Design a protein around this ligand. Structure first.
Ligand SMILES: Nc1nc2c(ncn2[C@@H]2O[C@H](COP(=O)(O)OP(=O)(O)O)[C@@H](O)[C@H]2O)c(=O)[nH]1
Length: 378
């Protein structure tokens, strides 16, 4: 059994996307075969958190872990002391620039994980050269979607083998609602069993397409007068969204940022989950994957996804629909059509749940990581 050291600046108790990614991936592995080397933002909160774990965390007593000689030295010592076989950089740029030292220290395999940022790194000349240096020193480069791969593949070069490793979804916590729970949730919101409910859970920023949803509502409301768009989340774009929703205000609910379990109950009680993501920022503001799509399918709820980035990759023709956010006529048509067909909706949600259980759970994704970390080097 090969032993892995994960080297990261992004680790709990701090809250974030990479933090969740690593935490949930590490928990899929045998805890005796895992050591973490992480920076420390608050010493007493880090110690309190590390004591809840069944695997070792070694804290680097700096607020940010940077690719420096002292950090590489410390990483090297751990590699030899703990007899490390795999070195895993939880985020490729810039920390995986220490991959050379990992090989010098005696590690037989170096893995680096990309997420969203390396797409932006693909554009600048010097930034692109750092991606090349990482690529020459890393044996396995993981990516969240076929879209992100296409964007940065040539920057990294052909030395590493490229492996698909997106986040999974907890299929025991994101689970279809009982008729009891769903009915009670709706009453909590001031709705009934018959209220048409569209849910959008996401940060309130232009690219998520809550603006597109709001502009599609007049037609939906005309067709289904009691239809409700639930906007779950917070963000800078809220005030613009509230202004867009002025004339449809009776049918749009800004629920703000909900507690974790309330967010799951609200989602599971919805008829449709919609988030018509578009690409903005000159091609830089993109949906890398879209975990919310996987969470909706896990709750057995039909999905409307956008054309942005890796968003289409989350759904099948059986489980969800892919739409252009700016196409308001089509988005409205799709929502009304889906709201008027409860048989199709029941079929799409069932297929969505089966889809995540077959391809997107932490059990499935954990098996993929096991394969990467436990296979002999080529
Ligand atoms: N508890 C809670 N979680 C939310 C809320 N809005 C979004 N999220 C979570 O934030 C995550 C969003 O990730 P993702 O979809 O990938 O989009 P990203 O943030 O852009 O990367 C998902 O896991 C959501 O469940 C909210 O209002 N409450």
């Amino acid at each position: 059994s090969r032993k892995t050291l994960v080297v990261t600046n992004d680790f709990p108790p701090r809250i974030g996307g990479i933090q969740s990614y690593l935490r949930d991936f590490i928990a899929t592995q045998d805890p005796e075969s895992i050591v973490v080397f992480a920076s420390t933002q608050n010493a007493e909160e880090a110690h309190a958190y590390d004591k809840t774990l069944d695997y070792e965390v070694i804290r680097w007593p700096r607020s940010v872990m940077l690719p420096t000689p002292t950090t590489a030295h410390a990483m090297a010592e751990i590699i030899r002391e703990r007899e490390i076989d795999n070195v895993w950089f939880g985020a490729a740029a810039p920390l995986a620039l220490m991959a050379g030292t990992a090989k010098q220290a005696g590690a037989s395999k170096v893995i680096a994980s990309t997420h969203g940022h390396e797409v932006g790194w693909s554009m600048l000349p010097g930034s692109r050269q750092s991606l090349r240096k990482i690529g020459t020193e890393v044996d396995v480069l993981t990516y969240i979607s076929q879209y992100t791969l296409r964007r940065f593949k040539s920057a990294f070069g052909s030395h590493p083998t490229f492996e698909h490793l997106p986040s999974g979804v907890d299929v025991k916590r994101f689970t279809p609602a009982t008729p009891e729970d769903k009915s009670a949730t709706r009453k909590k919101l001031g709705f009934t069993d018959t209220t048409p409910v569209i849910a959008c859970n996401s940060r309130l920023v232009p690219r998520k397409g809550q603006d597109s949803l709001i502009k599609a509502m007049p037609q939906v409301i005309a067709a289904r007068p009691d239809a409700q768009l639930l906007i779950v989340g917070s963000g800078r774009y809220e005030s613009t969204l509230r202004r867009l929703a002025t004339d449809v205000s009776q049918n749009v609910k800004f629920l703000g940022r909900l507690e974790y379990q309330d967010m799951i109950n609200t989602l599971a009680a919805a008829d449709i989950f919609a988030m018509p993501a578009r690409t903005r920022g000159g091609g830089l503001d993109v949906e890398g994957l879209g975990i919310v799509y996987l969470e909706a399918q896990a709750c057995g709820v039909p999905v409307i996804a956008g054309t942005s980035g890796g968003a289409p990759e989350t759904v099948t023709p059986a489980t969800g629909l892919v739409v252009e956010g700016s196409d308001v006529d089509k988005l409205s048509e799709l929502l009304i059509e889906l709201l008027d067909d409860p048989i199709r909706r029941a079929a799409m949600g069932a297929a969505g749940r089966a889809h995540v259980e077959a391809e997107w759970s932490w059990e499935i994704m954990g098996e993929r990581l096991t394969n990467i970390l436990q296979s002999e080097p080529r």
